[PDB]
Amino acid sequence: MLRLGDIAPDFEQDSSEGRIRLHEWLGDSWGVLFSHPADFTPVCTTELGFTAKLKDQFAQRGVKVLALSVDPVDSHLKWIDDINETQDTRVNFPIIADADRKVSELYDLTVRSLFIIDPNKKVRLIITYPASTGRNFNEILRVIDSLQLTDEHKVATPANWEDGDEVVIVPSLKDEEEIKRRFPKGYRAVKPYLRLTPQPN
Amino acid sequence: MLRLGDIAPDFEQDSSEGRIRLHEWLGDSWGVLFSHPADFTPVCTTELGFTAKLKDQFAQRGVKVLALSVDPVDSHLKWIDDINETQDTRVNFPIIADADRKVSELYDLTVRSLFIIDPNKKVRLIITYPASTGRNFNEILRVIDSLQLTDEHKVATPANWEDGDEVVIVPSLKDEEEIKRRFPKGYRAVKPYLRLTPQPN
Numbered sequence: 304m305l306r307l308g309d310i311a312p313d314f315e316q317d318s319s320e321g322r323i324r325l326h327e328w329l330g331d332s333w334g335v336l337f338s339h340p341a342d343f344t345p346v347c348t349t350e351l352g353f354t355a356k357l358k359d360q361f362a363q364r365g366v367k368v369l370a371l372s373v374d375p376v377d378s379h380l381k382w383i384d385d386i387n388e389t390q391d392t393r394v395n396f397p398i399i400a401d402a403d404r405k406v407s408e409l410y411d412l413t414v415r416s417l418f419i420i421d422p423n424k425k426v427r428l429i430i431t432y433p434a435s436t437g438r439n440f441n442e443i444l445r446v447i448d449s450l451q452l453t454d455e456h457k458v459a460t461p462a463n464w465e466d467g468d469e470v471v472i473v474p475s476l477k478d479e480e481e482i483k484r485r486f487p488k489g490y491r492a493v494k495p496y497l498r499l500t501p502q503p504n
Numbered sequence: 505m506l507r508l509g510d511i512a513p514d515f516e517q518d519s520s521e522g523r524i525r526l527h528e529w530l531g532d533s534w535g536v537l538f539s540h541p542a543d544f545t546p547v548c549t550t551e552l553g554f555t556a557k558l559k560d561q562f563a564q565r566g567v568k569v570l571a572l573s574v575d576p577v578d579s580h581l582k583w584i585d586d587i588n589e590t591q592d593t594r595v596n597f598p599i600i601a602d603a604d605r606k607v608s609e610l611y612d613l614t615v616r617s618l619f620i621i622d623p624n625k626k627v628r629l630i631i632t633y634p635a636s637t638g639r640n641f642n643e644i645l646r647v648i649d650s651l652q653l654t655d656e657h658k659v660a661t662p663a664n665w666e667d668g669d670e671v672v673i674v675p676s677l678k679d680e681e682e683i684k685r686r687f688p689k690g691y692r693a694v695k696p697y698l699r700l701t702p703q704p705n
């Protein structure tokens with residue numbers, strides 16, 4: 304029902320780091336909300352492990368990270384021992400306890416979803432993966448870079464774009480003077496609808 | 505409404521390679537159905553370009569690839585010139601023309617969706633990306649490898665798993681004799697719920 308461009312619903316809820324008021328807690332930065340169906344599940348253990356190891360990577364992009372599970376806070380803190388010990392890491396982000404299902408109803412939640420939330424609290428990507436298959440975390444960082452650049456500049460990122468790669472002038476932008484103004488590096492109209500420009504940063 | 509574990513609805517429809525009866529056309533292999541909102545759009549041009557370049561990669565995994573757009577077949581064939589010329593590639597897969605919206609209603613279709621379909625015609629992953637952001641195609645191949653392995657073996661793939669990496673005994677499998685039987689390479693119970701085993705292939 305929740306979809307891309309909708310506002311990520313606010314909530315107040317207990318976490319392994321205390322009460323989180325989502326919109327306040329995010330403030331200015333981008334957000335990632337990772338859902339886990341249960342505590343003490345194996346793929347999720349490796350996922351959180353890896354999310355902890357990429358803390359520098361998210362902070363450097365001004366991204367704040369939450370995890371969400373129905374199990375209570377005291378359970379999350381036992382699991383954080385498991386994750387720390389087995390994944391050789393330190394969990395350094397909040398795990399929400401949704402023991403009343405307050406957040407789970409709002410985000411329309413065997414599959415596990417991930418929501419990327421922008422500074423205006425808009426949902427910018429929903430990724431749902433089945434229990435069988437852990438996530439690739441390079442892909443969420445890449446997607447965040449693309450999202451940040453395309454909010455600041457009138458570009459889209461092509462297939463197999465990585466931060467720094469050549470981009471595409473967004474098709475809606477047709478005014479020649481505004482293009483000249485926004486892209487001093489210029490562009491190659493390899494087709495009239497395919498205007499390739501250096502990443503303008 | 506369409507979801508993971510549902511059957512990918514069958515359809516007969518015109519394509520740049522002729523009439524496609526999806527279930528027949530897939531037959532035994534895995535499927536990827538890539539949706540594009542329109543022909544002659546820039547990100548999609550790079551996406552199809554790249555899908556064409558990975559034909560060896562999909563075939564080697566016994567995966568068949570379709571693209572879907574509302575524009576008519578004669579339009580797809582003009583666009584295939586554009587894609588061939590600008591992407592330095594040869595489009596070698598069918599692009600469905602959905603000029604009656606027959607397929608678009610069935611798959612519940614600015615965002616563009618991708619459906620991974622197994623040999624039993626079940627939907628195994630839905631990925632929806634916004635217009636701003638081209639896909640990473642390493643990630644769809646990785647996901648396919650994980651899906652194929654977890655259908656054949658009672659394992660899940662951990663975070664940042666690549667074909668060959670160590671996996672996890674699926675949590676539902678508890679019978680010790682059946683574990684011994686299925687995993688002669690053995691496993692490390694680093695926790696009772698986190699049983700790491702070599703990729704059994």
Ligand SMILES: [Cl-]
Pocket residue numbers: 463464465468
């Ligand atoms: Cl690249």
Ligand SMILES: [Cl-]
Pocket residue numbers: 664665666669
């Ligand atoms: Cl790996």
